[PDB]
Amino acid sequence: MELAVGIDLGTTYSCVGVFQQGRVEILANDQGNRTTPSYVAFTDTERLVGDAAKSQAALNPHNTVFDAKRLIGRKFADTTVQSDMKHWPFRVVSEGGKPKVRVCYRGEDKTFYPEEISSMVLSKMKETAEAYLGQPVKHAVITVPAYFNDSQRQATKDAGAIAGLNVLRIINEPTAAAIAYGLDRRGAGERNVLIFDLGGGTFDVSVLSIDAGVFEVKATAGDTHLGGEDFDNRLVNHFMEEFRRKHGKDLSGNKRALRRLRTACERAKRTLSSSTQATLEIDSLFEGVDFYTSITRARFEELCSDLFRSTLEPVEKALRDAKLDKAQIHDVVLVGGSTRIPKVQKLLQDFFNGKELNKSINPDEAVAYGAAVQAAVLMGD
Ligand SMILES: Nc1ncnc2c1ncn2[C@@H]1O[C@H](COP(=O)(O)OP(=O)(O)O)[C@@H](O)[C@H]1O
Ligand SMILES: [Mg+2]
């Protein structure tokens, strides 16, 4: 009766599914969400993980950790680590050439390796599954980006082990998304698959060839610093200029106000994926002044148009590297929460001369969904 789970340990949002009784169930968390921010907050009395960690970042910025995936399996001296450090409000230090994050927890100075932070997220996902299933969960498939190296892969497996999971297999995110749609189980014949994965922090284009169930990654392109959080930042800039005009103050040096604004921006952005208009409502944003306004989809689309358009160059480069024409791609699959933006879908579809996109599985859940299938395969006979 033991079920294994599939876990997407994502840069910004993680997700857990289980293959049970015909179907794959993606599990809702402590606040009812099907994805969970990869955030851990250390307070005076609690260690919070996920949504409650993210929501109290405004008030406790130095002890609220995120982006651990960006440190995992790297050295402190790496140029990408030193660059990313300038943008984080939590301290990163060096221990034996390895990054650790430094925080205050229960009034005490503590340091943790990136795999320890990631194990806390994986422990939450494990317990989330246990609450739903009403039984122990001891086995998992965990996904990683196609470009992860061996030491990044081992360090992710260790995060799993530290969380009490026996890791059945570390599989690539784009391969998991293809498995989610059964693309490796369409009989004989090679197929070429393009995975367009636009997440919260990273953009990944992968060209896969599938034959007799064997996956080969033909090409990858993208940008590790393009994702939903950049669309949030465009909205943040728009609304701080609107706050200036409406209320006569610049809030660009008040970190707390900018963080509260960022939260309200991300919500508004999500609403614009299914409505043409969204309100933005924040009590006491700055010096006790409330900020209540709205924005159209069309205006959000203008604000990010260069960013959206830029996602097509990597698609083209990847196809070039794979030595394929776009008409030779059998399947295009939407992955990542940012591919729920209607304009992003229109841009990709027009690029593929009107080809229908695989998007029936919620793009932010597709990786966990394929991992769940794969975990079931590996538990089987
Ligand atoms: N309905 C939506 N419309 C637009 N963006 C969304 C929507 N839902 C989630 N997102 C965004 O998707 C990103 C999270 O992507 P996801 O794939 O879940 O995580 P990750 O990229 O860490 O794997 C965030 O920027 C989030 O705001
Ligand atoms: Mg992802």
Author numbering: 5 to 385
Authors' own words:
The 70-kDa heat shock proteins (Hsp70) are chaperones with central roles in processes that involve polypeptide remodeling events. Hsp70 proteins bind and release client polypeptides in a cycle that is coupled to an ATPase activity. We present the first crystal structures of four human Hsp70 isoforms, those of the NBDs of HSPA1L, HSPA2, HSPA5 and HSPA6.
The HSPA6/Hsp70B' gene is strictly inducible with no detectable basal expression. The HSPA6 protein is nuclear and cytosolic. In all ATPase domains except for that of HSPA5/BiP the products of ATP hydrolysis, including inorganic phosphate, were observed. To illustrate this we color coded the rmsd in Cα atom positions between the pairs HSPA6 - HSPA1L, HSPA6 - HSPA5, and HSPA6 - E.coli DnaK, and mapped them onto the structure of HSPA6. The overall structures of the four human Hsp70 ATPase domains that were determined here for the first time all closely resemble the structure of HSPA1A and related previously determined structures.
